[PDB]
Coordinates of N, CA, C and O and ligand atoms in Angstrom, one line a residue:
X1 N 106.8 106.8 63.3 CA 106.4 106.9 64.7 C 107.5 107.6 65.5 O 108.2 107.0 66.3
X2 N 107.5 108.8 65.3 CA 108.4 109.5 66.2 C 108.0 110.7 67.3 O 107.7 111.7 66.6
X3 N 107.9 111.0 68.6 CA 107.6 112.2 69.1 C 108.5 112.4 69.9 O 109.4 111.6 70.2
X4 N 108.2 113.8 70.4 CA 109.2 114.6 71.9 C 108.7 115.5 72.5 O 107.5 115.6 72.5
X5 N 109.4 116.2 73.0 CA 108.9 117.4 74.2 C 107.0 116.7 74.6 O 106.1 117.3 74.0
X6 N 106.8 115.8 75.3 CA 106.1 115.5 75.7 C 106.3 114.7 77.0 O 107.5 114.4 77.3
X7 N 105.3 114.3 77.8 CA 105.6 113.8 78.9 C 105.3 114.7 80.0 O 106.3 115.5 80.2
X8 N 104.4 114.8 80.8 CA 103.9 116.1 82.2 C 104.4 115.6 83.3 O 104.8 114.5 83.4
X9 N 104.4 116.3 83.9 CA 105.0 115.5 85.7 C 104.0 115.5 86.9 O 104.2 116.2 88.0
X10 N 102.8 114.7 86.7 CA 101.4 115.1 88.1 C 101.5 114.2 88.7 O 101.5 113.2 88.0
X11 N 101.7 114.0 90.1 CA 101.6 112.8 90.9 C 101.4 113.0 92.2 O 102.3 113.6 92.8
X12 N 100.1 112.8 93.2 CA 99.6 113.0 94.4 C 98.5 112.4 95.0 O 97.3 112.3 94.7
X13 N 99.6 111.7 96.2 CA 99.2 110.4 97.1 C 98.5 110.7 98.1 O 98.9 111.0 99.2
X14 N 97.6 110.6 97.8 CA 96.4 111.3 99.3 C 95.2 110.0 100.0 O 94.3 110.2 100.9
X15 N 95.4 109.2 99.5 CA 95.2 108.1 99.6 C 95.3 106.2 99.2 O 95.7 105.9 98.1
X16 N 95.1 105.5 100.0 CA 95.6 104.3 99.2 C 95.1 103.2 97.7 O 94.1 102.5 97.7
X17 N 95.5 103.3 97.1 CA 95.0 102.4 95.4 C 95.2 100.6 95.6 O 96.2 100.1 96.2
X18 N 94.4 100.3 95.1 CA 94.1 99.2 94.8 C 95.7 98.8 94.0 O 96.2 99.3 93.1
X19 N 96.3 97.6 94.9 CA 96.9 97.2 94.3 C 97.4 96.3 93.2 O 98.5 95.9 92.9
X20 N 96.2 96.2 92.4 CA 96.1 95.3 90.9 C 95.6 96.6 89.8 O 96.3 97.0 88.8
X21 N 94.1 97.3 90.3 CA 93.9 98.5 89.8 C 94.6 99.6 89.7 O 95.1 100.2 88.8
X22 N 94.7 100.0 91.2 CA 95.2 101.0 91.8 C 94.6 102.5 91.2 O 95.1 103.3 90.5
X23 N 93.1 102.4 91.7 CA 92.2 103.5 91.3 C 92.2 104.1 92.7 O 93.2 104.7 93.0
X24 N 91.4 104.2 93.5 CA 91.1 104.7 94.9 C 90.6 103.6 96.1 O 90.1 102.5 95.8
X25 N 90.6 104.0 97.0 CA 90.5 103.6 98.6 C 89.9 104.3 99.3 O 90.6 104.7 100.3
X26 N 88.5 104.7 99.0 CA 88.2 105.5 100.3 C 87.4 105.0 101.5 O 87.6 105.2 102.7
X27 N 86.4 104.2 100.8 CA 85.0 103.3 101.7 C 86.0 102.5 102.0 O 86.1 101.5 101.4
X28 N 86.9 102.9 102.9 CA 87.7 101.3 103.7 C 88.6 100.6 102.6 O 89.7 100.9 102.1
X29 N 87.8 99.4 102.5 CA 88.7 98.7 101.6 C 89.0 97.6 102.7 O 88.4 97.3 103.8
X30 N 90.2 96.9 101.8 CA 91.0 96.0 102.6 C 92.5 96.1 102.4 O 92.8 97.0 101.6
X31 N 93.5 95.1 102.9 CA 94.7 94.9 102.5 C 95.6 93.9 102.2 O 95.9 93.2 103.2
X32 N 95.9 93.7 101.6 CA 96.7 91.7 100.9 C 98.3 92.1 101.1 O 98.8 92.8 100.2
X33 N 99.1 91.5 102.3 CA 100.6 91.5 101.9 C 100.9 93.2 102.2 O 101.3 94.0 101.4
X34 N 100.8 93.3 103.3 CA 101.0 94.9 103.6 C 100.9 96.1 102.2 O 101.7 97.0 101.9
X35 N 99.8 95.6 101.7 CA 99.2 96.4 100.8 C 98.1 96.4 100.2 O 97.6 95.3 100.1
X36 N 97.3 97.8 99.5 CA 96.1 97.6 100.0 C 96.0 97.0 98.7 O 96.8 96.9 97.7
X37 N 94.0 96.7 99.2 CA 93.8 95.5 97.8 C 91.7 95.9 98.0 O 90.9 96.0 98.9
X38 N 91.7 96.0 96.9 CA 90.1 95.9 96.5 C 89.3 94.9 97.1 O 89.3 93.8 96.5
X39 N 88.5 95.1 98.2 CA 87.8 94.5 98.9 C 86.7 93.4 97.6 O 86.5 92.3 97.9
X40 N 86.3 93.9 96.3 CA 85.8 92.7 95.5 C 87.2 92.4 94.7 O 86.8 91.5 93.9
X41 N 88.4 92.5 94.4 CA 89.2 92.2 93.6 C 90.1 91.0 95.0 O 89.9 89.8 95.0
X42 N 90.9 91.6 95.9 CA 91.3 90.4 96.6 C 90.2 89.2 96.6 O 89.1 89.3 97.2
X43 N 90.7 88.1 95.9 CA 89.9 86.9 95.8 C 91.0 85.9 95.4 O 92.1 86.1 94.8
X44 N 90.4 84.2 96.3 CA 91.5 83.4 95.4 C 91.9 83.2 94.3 O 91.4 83.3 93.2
X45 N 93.0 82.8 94.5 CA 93.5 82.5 92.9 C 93.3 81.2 92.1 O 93.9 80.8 91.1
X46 N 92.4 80.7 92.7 CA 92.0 79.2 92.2 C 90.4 79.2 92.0 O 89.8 78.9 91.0
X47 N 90.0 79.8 93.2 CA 87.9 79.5 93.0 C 87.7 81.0 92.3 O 87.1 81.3 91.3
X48 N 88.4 81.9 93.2 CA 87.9 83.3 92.6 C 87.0 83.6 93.7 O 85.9 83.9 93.5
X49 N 87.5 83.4 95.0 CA 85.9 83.5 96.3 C 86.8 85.1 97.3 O 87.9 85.3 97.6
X50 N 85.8 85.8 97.4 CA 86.2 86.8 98.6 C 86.6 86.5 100.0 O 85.8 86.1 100.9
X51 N 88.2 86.6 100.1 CA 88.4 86.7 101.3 C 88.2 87.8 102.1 O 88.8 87.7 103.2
X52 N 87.6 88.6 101.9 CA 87.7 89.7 102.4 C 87.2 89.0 104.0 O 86.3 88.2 104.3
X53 N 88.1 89.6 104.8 CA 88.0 89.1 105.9 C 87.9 87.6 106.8 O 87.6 87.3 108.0
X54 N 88.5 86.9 105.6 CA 88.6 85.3 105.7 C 89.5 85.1 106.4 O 90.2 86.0 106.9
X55 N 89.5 83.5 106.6 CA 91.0 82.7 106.7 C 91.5 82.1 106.0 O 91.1 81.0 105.7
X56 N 92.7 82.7 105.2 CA 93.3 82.0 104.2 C 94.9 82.1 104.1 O 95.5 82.9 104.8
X57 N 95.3 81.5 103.3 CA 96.7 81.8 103.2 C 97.4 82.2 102.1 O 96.7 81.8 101.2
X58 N 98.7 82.9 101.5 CA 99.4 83.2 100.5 C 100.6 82.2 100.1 O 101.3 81.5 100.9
X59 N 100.8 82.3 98.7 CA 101.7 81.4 98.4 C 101.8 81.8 96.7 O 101.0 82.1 95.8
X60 N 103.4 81.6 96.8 CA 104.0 82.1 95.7 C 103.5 83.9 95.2 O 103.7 84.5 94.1
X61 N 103.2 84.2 95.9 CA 102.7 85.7 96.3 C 101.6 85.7 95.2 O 101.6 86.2 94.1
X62 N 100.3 85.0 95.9 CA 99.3 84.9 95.4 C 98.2 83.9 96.8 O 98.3 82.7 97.2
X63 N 97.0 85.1 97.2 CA 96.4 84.9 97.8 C 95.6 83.5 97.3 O 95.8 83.3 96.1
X64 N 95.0 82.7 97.9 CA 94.7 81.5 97.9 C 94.2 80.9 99.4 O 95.0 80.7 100.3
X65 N 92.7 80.7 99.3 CA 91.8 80.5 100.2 C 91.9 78.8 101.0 O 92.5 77.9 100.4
X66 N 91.5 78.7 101.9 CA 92.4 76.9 102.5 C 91.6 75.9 102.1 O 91.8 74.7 102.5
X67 N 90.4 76.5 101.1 CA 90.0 75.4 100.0 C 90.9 74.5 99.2 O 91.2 73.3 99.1
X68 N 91.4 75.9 98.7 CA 92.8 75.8 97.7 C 93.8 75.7 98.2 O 94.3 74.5 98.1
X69 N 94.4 76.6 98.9 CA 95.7 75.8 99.3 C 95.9 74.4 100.2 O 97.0 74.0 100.3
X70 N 95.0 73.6 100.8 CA 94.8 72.4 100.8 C 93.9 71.6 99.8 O 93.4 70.6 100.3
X71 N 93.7 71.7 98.7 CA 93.7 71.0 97.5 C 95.0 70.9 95.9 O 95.3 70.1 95.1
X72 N 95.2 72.3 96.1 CA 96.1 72.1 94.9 C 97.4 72.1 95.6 O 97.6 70.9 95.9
X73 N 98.4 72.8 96.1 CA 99.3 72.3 96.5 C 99.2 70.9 97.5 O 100.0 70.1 97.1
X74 N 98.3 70.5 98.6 CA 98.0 69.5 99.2 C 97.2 68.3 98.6 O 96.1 68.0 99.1
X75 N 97.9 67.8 97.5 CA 96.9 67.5 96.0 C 97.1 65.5 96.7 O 97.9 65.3 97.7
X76 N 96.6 64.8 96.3 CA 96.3 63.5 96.4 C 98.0 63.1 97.1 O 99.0 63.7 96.8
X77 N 97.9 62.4 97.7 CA 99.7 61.9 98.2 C 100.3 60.9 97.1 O 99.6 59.9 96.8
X78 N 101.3 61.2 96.8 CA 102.0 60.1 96.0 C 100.8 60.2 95.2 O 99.9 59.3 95.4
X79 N 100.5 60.9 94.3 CA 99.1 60.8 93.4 C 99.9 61.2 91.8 O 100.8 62.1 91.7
X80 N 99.5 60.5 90.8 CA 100.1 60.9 89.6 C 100.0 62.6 89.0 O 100.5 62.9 87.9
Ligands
ZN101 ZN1 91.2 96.5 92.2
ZN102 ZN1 90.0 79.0 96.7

């Protein structure tokens, strides 16, 4: 398994990518964390629900809806 003289140099930012995919942005979109994010891909990280345009919050740099973030981190008190 050996190669060389390979490798091209193309790269041109004319718009914003999904930041998990990072395919294209043009119908709008949305943004997670001062960056952009796939209006069906931004989703929690626990149910898997669209925030797109929700109220929710981030943690551990992972979007999470206040279903979730008041269930799993705000989990039963003194609970085993
Ligand atoms: Zn995406
Ligand atoms: Zn959730």
């Amino acid at each position: 398994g050996s190669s060389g003289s390979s490798g091209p140099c193309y790269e041109n930012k004319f718009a914003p990518r999904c930041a998990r995919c990072s395919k294209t942005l043009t119908q709008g979109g949305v943004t997670y964390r001062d960056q952009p994010w796939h209006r069906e891909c931004l989703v929690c990280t626990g149910c898997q629900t669209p925030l797109a345009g929700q109220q929710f919050t981030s943690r551990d740099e992972d979007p999470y809806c206040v279903a979730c973030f008041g269930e799993l981190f705000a989990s039963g008190p003194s609970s085993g």
